[PDB]
Design a binder for this molecule. Structure first.
Ligand SMILES: N[C@@H](Cc1ccccc1)C(=O)O
Ligand SMILES: N[C@@H](Cc1ccccc1)C(=O)O
Lengths: 100, 100
């Protein structure tokens, strides 16, 4: 039975998609690592990360995290992130582009 | 070697500048948080962060971290970062070039 062939195996996938969420936190040191460690807990790797800091004396800053993961996993992760801070923006900042 | 009790009431803002370093790590999940937690240890906040992922099947990825801190503190931090991975790129001056 086993050991016969199996040199190649195709895994099914539910198409492809991306997820992104804007997470806000205090401009404290290490605030970002606590936000990203949650992604590590769910074993979700990020593909892009960008932080924006305003000079309007804002105590809080917005950090954009882009990652690819299942929508269910994503929703669960977002719910955990929402615990730390209220997230009302779940859209990417396509308004601002970067040279990259 | 603990010092004596005292307080530094002398401060100077004569020295000012920015620091940046390119830190490379494996494309593992949570690799970035370990890199950034070191900044937290030195109480260094980052002002900009950007990660680059290639599709050339590179096991390692390069993450750019920009922060403002003392040069001495920065050098010490870099030395700690160098422990985790060899860093040969330290924000090179690609703006100018020479043909020596
Ligand atoms: N994929 C790695 C490195 C990385 C961080 C952020 C953006 C892109 C890549 C991680 O999740 O730690
Ligand atoms: N200043 C905060 C948030 C931040 C992260 C990265 C870039 C800019 C700001 C921190 O160091 O966690």
């Amino acid at each position: 039975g086993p050991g016969n062939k199996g040199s190649s195996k195709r895994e099914a996938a539910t198409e492809s998609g991306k997820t992104a969420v804007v997470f806000s936190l205090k401009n404290e040191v290490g605030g970002l690592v606590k936000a990203l460690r949650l992604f590590q807990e769910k074993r979700v790797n990020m593909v892009h990360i960008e932080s924006r800091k305003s000079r309007r004396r804002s105590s809080e800053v917005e950090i954009f995290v882009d990652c690819e993961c299942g929508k269910t996993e994503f929703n669960e992760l977002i719910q955990l992130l929402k615990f730390q801070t209220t997230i009302v923006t779940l859209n990417p900042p396509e308004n601002i582009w970067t040279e990259e």
